Amino acid sequence: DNDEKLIIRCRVVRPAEEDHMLKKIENTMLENITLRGVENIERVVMMK
Amino acid sequence: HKLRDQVLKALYDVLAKESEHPPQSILHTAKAIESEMNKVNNCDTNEAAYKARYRIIYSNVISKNNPDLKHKIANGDITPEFLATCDAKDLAPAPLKQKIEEIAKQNLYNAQGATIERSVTDRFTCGKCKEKKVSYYQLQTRSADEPLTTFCTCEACGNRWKFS
Amino acid sequence: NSDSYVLLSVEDDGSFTMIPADKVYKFTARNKYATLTIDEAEKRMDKKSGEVPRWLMKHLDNIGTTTTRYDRT
Amino acid sequence: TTFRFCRDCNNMLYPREDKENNRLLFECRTCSYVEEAGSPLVYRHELITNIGETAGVVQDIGSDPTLPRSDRECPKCHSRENVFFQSQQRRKDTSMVLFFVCLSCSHIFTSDQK
Ligand SMILES: [Zn+2]
Ligand SMILES: [Zn+2]
Ligand SMILES: [Zn+2]
């Protein structure tokens, strides 16, 4: 967390064609991994 | 003990890699082992948070920015405190720290939202509080044969009323 | 604009011949690279795969099916 | 991230991997021409875009009437005539940046005050 650039390194482990599998995988990564907070709640503001 | 000796090997490597190559090799490996025991004073190979704190301290030593932390740990920075810091956000380095507080301040500003503020006048009195801090608006609601609505909004207590 | 065009060629003696051009045809090279075919093409484009194979044509050529016209000759 | 087409037949080369020497062989799929690429970067997304504010600079902007005119100087030619207009990339979160173009030097310059 102390670096000036934040990168995540990831590779698929395997027991050809890997481009579109990686595309689908990263698409799923972007879409579905929750980080924190309850779903169906969007940007929340606080008033005084 | 494999994790013990691995952390020791890493620590001896990073302190031998310092710009101040310490001729006090036994003293600096004593620093390494005492940092090892005060590090395992958290969990001693019982929880992965030990590994996480290891990653934090190891990469902070590596980073460059900053390099001066190597000399500062070689000549001070008593490590039993640095088990219990968890203070990576307040070290290595100060410009990045200042960046962090200004980021946090801007985020806190952007969190709190709309604050429309209801421009007033002083002519009418409140329907309930009876004081003159009255704010209004104009628009016409019903059919064309009549004028606007003359909406009212008190601000001394927040009352709403209307005038024809 | 085949009508508006008109031809002028210098001949060997320097004769400038006067031909009203009638039509123009555009030619494209074809099957220079062993084109695939309709049916297995349909099985490829059907939504059975998240993506079709990257080197599918090269794999079919290594199998040996659908050679070029020059290769058939 | 740009596309390189097969010179032998105008189709973009595709990424495919050397199985043994481990190199970026941009191969044609139409024909069998192959090409070695330069960098391991292949795919590129840019989830956040912030570009386009100076769009459509044609060589003869000054021929239009409806652009306004002002009196700032071009800091190449110092001619007092110039033309300014709003940022072109019409999003809901763009700015009030004014882009000044002068007819004399045919040169663009902004008025940012950061
Ligand atoms: Zn009131
Ligand atoms: Zn080709
Ligand atoms: Zn100028």
Curated annotation (Swiss-Prot), chain C:
It comes from Saccharomyces cerevisiae (strain ATCC 204508 / S288c) (Baker's yeast). The lineage of its organism: Eukaryota, Fungi, Dikarya, Ascomycota, Saccharomycotina. The gene is TFG1. It is found in: Nucleus. Present with 1920 molecules/cell in log phase SD medium. This is Transcription initiation factor IIF subunit alpha. Phosphorylated on Ser and other residues by TAF1 and casein kinase II-like kinases. TFIIF is composed of three different subunits: TFG1/RAP74, TFG2/RAP30 and TAF14. Belongs to the TFIIF alpha subunit family. TFIIF is a general transcription initiation factor that binds to RNA polymerase II. Its functions include the recruitment of RNA polymerase II to the promoter bound DNA-TBP-TFIIB complex, decreasing the affinity of RNA polymerase II for non-specific DNA, allowing for the subsequent recruitment of TFIIE and TFIIH, and facilitating RNA polymerase II elongation.
